[PDB]
Amino acid sequence: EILRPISSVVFVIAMQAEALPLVNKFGLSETTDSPLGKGLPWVLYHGVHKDLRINVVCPGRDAALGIDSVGTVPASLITFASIQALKPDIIINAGTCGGFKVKGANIGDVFLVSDVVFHDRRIPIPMFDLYGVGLRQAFSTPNLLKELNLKIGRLSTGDSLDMSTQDETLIIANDATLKDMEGAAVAYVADLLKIPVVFLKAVTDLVDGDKPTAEEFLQNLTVVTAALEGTATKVINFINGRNLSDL
Amino acid sequence: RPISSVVFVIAMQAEALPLVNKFGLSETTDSPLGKGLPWVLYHGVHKDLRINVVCPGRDAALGIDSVGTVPASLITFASIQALKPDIIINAGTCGGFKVKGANIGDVFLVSDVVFHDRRIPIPMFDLYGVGLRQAFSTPNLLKELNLKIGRLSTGDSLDMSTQDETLIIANDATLKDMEGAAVAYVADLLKIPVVFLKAVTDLVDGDKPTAEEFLQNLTVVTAALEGTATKVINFINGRNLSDL
């Protein structure tokens, strides 16, 4: 004890383009010293909204190839470094991802994740199977679900962007509404270091749906990311002034 | 200047203990890498060398070794930042391809390493998923110790799916594991030389269920890895990295 209102939050956002609209919305500033470590491509944005200190961290540009460092491994590293450096009350994993129409997802929905699994850590023996799947619960946010009326679902994570039949088999068996490339690894780290974790997952495509029309994916990313920033804004405002138990 | 500090990244307790005892390393009690994690760290000094062996520990929920890429990558990062080693050695058991010349008991050096389960069908993201990285070059060690060498392919599953095989075959891997490529990824971020000792416990092309063979060979093959790790430690002592 004694429990009190949430003071600081970190967002773990894999794609630096998914983070920018949140950074502008809040007048967050790219830190020029290097909190998380010297000589890393990781990007940190810092600011204060009202009663909330806000951190947004991105794994940044891959040195070899010039792209965002996607996947479970860079996401887990940055979750770990930013927790020890920054000491957040709560972690929010925000990002765009895939969705299943048969599970009720629609392009541009922003989901609040109920719980998360992996689909690509297959260790087919007793007790290593469960560990491989790595089922973790997102921190419970009944009031915020009531105010925002966001759709809810299980998220299933793997480091592959396509979907093999092996992935599909397990994503089906496990009832996932969503498929991304980071979340369950963020959930792992958060669990190790006992920090509440929330997920805001914006659906850009329907794994089990039709390919987008000409104009559709032309607009699609921009429109779905704006939808994601808009929901992230409302989460922050809601959180502001509240205790973890009041969430 | 001479190499003064080496860190072993070892995924499983059972792989680690033989080396712990051989060098009389002591279990770290102060949790330097972070309050409250399951990570295990043994410390010592051999001659000129500081020795540290870091393991991801028993899963808090399930009570078994915290295997796979994420734990590996976490402990590699955290131990590099805490200890500032000159070099990292990833040591462990793995599967080998018999048609590639691997045999049960063999302790391979590793030339370079790729991922087989990170498939991103976007230009430039494809090469990133694969994550081809070169092991630090140790020609004299290879020569003197007379070690087998080959490419290692990494992914988070113990079994092999069809598209797993496809990439393992395309990347001409001799060896299949669950950590190496991730360790290399991190060592690269932090510019630390990494080498790999990979001891073959099971033949992926062979006539046996993987985990039945894996577990049937483990006690003996882990003695074999200690055998090589010892010699590797003795060789490194007093040398520069360019001497390796």
Curated annotation (Swiss-Prot), chain A:
pH dependence: Optimum pH is 8.0.
Known catalytic reactions: S-methyl-5'-thioadenosine + H2O = 5-(methylsulfanyl)-D-ribose + adenine
EC annotation from Swiss-Prot or TrEMBL: 3.2.2.16
List of catalytic residues: 18 (proton acceptor), 205 (proton donor)
Keywords: Amino-acid biosynthesis, Hydrolase, Methionine biosynthesis
Tissue spec. comment: Expressed in roots, leaves, stems, cauline leaves and flowers.
Effects seen without this gene: No visible phenotype under normal growth condition. Not able to grow with methylthioadenosine (MTA) as unique source of sulfur.
InterPro entries per record: MTAN, Nucleoside_phosphorylase_d, Nucleoside_phosphorylase_sf
GO CC terms: cytosol; plasma membrane
GO biological process: L-methionine salvage from methylthioadenosine; nucleoside metabolic process; phloem or xylem histogenesis
Chain sites annotated for binding adenine: 179, 205
Residues that, per the record, bind S-methyl-5'-thioadenosine: 96, 179-182, 205
Top-rank EC class of the record's enzyme: hydrolase
Activity regulation behaviour: Inhibited by CBL3 in a calcium-dependent manner. Inhibited by 5'-methylthiotubercidin (MTT) and by formycin A (FMA).
Pathway of action: Amino-acid biosynthesis; L-methionine biosynthesis via salvage pathway; S-methyl-5-thio-alpha-D-ribose 1-phosphate from S-methyl-5'-thioadenosine (hydrolase route): step 1/2
Annotated GO MF terms: methylthioadenosine nucleosidase activity
Subunit structure: Homodimer. Interacts with CBL3 in a calcium-dependent manner.
Function: Enzyme of the methionine cycle that catalyzes the irreversible cleavage of the glycosidic bond in 5'-methylthioadenosine (MTA) to adenine and 5'-methylthioribose. Contributes to the maintenance of AdoMet homeostasis and is required to sustain high rates of ethylene synthesis. Inactive towards S-adenosylhomocysteine (SAH/AdoHcy).
Family: Belongs to the PNP/UDP phosphorylase family. MtnN subfamily.
Name used for this protein in its record: 5'-methylthioadenosine nucleosidase
Source organism of the structure: Arabidopsis thaliana (Mouse-ear cress)
Highest classification ranks of the organism: Eukaryota, Viridiplantae, Streptophyta, Embryophyta, Tracheophyta
